[PDB]
Design a binder for this molecule. Structure first.
Ligand code: CA
Ligand code: CA
Ligand code: CA
Ligand code: CA
Ligand code: CA
Ligand code: CA
Ligand code: CA
Ligand code: CA
Ligand code: CA
Ligand code: CA
Lengths: 206, 206, 206, 206, 206
């Protein structure tokens, strides 16, 4: 447990080896989740890259938040992909929240406090509880098989995770800096393992 | 009779079976009406869709609020169509109000509280009272004959209906969040039948 | 005699026969004037139309506020026209004031409270007092000879006329709301005649 | 001495005969100065024009503020010219302040209270104090030899001149309209001489 | 020790002879530094120019802040360049802070108080402390070999340097203007040497 308030991980150059593993304390697989984070990179108009990689032994892309070059955000649950297209590329730190619900198949994707349209993905599915959660790289195996061309060059912080769906009002307060209590991953009480060229500095965003 | 305050219908994927049917004890025939609603979809740049379908046994498009690809808003009364071109599209939730008056034929269209030009459509006409009112699909027959290529993928909410033409100040009240009392369809006292892949969730718009 | 406060004239479709005739107490040739009005149309990027037509038995375009397609505003006094070009069109209600002073020849044109450059037109000319003043049509003879290709389709209101040149501070209050007393045509004490399909409804602009 | 507060000289059309002559109580050869003024014109994308023409018996272009078409502002001291390029022209009234210092050669150019870079011009030169100062025309001789194609068509006012360089804070006050006292040319106590078709009217800018 | 508060060095025109030499209490090797300054120029779209030149006997480009035509900001340390692309150029005064840390190799670049992404440069290297610090000119040798082609035409001011990396909150204070004390170069206690055509005038920025 580390309090990472006002701190962010920094991956200053492209690599195959720099990553942070996030220790999720769980048993019950997930019928729903919400993932929020800040990140900052210039890669957006040169190549794709992995924002948040959640892998299980049977599924490498169990939850994957990814950026596809000339497309926008790619959201994947259980190997199935949905896109959140972005016409114009923004050059500044970005806060995203994303949720998915098994019961309904509804995914929500929130960019800088503003919501994209609701979409459907993996209705009735269950996300596995024994996971390998990675920042800075895209998993192709449980905890490994990284590709440098999918690596995050930049900052990533305020990563949080819930095992239910956040409401629009709740997302609004997280974004506005208000109080909250995540029950899967907590930035303020995070367990983690650093590997490779990655540093802990003060966050660049306000 | 359900209080749908702060909630919206969610049509998270394309189909020809998902819809909501709105019910009312319908009074005398209509010599005028106003219908206001919020909706949010990403379909505007890809194909057309139906936003509000009001059908009678005699006319499948008795009142139709439609979006027409590369053109803009389509507003139909008694089978006759009028257009409100929209040069660039906004990728955000949208609030609309629209009215028609039999006496003058005057049609109004309001987008996020701002009025379009007043136009003319079906003067002397009388809108049928025995009707089938549908969200999510375009009627080609009374209560049916939907087309998937005309389905709404997204959210729709705050649907209200009056049997008279709202003044500009009254439209202002509706849009700014003031209290009001609609006399045909009331989102706070909504009587409806849900069908296929439709969800009730908290509204995405303020 | 009629108080037209907060009400506008509505010309909902193209026609040869819909117009309003404005009656002024007027009885001394004009050596100067000012005309202010509000109008709203979509015709601007399709064809020209007449905003304010002041005909005299010897001159059909004695005063004419007109929109020329792909050019901008046209202002004519005693048959002589000058242009106020607009590179880009606004799709919203628009408030205009315009003045002319025989003594100097100076013409002013104000759009949404914002002045164009001062220009010169018909210095030392005199504007006739016996007049036919028409909204919705362009006159080619005292009180008639209209053409549908020059008709106003939309809303026009807040029409006021003075017999002297308003100052910049005076136009500023006229545009923002303020009190004023026009001495030729008064929107709050207006005498008029309606002809054809033209309607009185609440104004769309604040 | 006339107080020209809230008033401006109007040059309604093109001519080589319309101009205002400004009377300084001039004194000793100047080794610094600052000139501020408001002007409004539409000639900007058609031709150039003189804004401020200061000629001495020996130097016709002793101080000249000019607008060069397709380029921007042209500032000339002692016959010697420097440019201030303007990529995009705006059609609105504009306030400019310019200064020059002999000791350093430093020229300053201010447009709407915002400064252009500092530039170098005529270091160690002295500006003749026995001068003819003209508005609305460009001098090619002491007090004459105008050219119609260099003529200002539009309004010019708020003309003041000091015999020293104004600081950034001092300019900011002038631009904001704060209280100030010029010692060479005072708009509030102006001695001038009008010739041709030029009119005094209320200023069009705030 | 001169307090250069509210003042800037002005380089009115291109040359290879005008420069300012900054003098620092010649301490020990730098394992980290931060440099902050204001500058205002119009050269960005015509050619590249040197903002801040820090040169040792061994290395001509020991710390070099530069502007590269059609590229953006060039930040170089111990001969290794890193780029910060700027798609669109702002013709206004600009405040930058840059920092480098040996331990991590992380560089930071801050434009008008907004951070660019963290990049990597010269990890483990050490910046020499026997230095020549020049404004207005680019060094290709210790205190010499200037190319007018690389000279700053404009204003430069509020130069401050620290021997450690400033935090995000610290940089906000420097940009918004709060109180601070730099330990390498203090603009409020500056020792310097002026050469050529360079003057001291009031700063143009707040
Ligand atoms: Ca993968
Ligand atoms: Ca991979
Ligand atoms: Ca139909
Ligand atoms: Ca259909
Ligand atoms: Ca005519
Ligand atoms: Ca005609
Ligand atoms: Ca000349
Ligand atoms: Ca001349
Ligand atoms: Ca060098
Ligand atoms: Ca060099």
């Amino acid at each position: 447990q580390t309090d990472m308030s006002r701190k962010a991980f920094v991956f200053p150059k492209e690599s195959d080896t720099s990553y942070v593993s996030l220790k999720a304390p769980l048993t019950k697989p997930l019928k729903a989740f919400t993932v929020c984070l800040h990140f900052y990179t210039e890669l957006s108009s040169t190549r794709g890259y992995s924002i948040f990689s959640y892998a299980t032994k049977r599924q490498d892309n169990e939850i994957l938040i990814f950026w596809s070059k000339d497309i926008g955000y790619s959201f994947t649950v259980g190997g199935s992909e949905i896109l959140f297209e972005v016409p114009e590329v923004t050059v500044a730190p970005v806060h995203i929240c994303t949720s998915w619900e098994s019961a309904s198949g509804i995914v929500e994707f929130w960019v800088d406090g503003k919501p994209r349209v609701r979409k459907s993905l993996k209705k009735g599915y269950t996300v596995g509880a024994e996971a390998s959660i990675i920042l800075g790289q895209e998993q192709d195996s449980f905890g490994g098989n990284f590709e440098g061309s999918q690596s995050l060059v930049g900052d990533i912080g305020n990563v949080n995770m819930w095992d239910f769906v956040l409401s629009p009002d709740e997302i609004n307060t997280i974004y506005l800096g208000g109080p909250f209590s995540p029950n899967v991953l907590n930035w303020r009480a995070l367990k983690y393992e650093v590997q490779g060229e990655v540093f802990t500095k003060p966050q660049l965003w306000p």
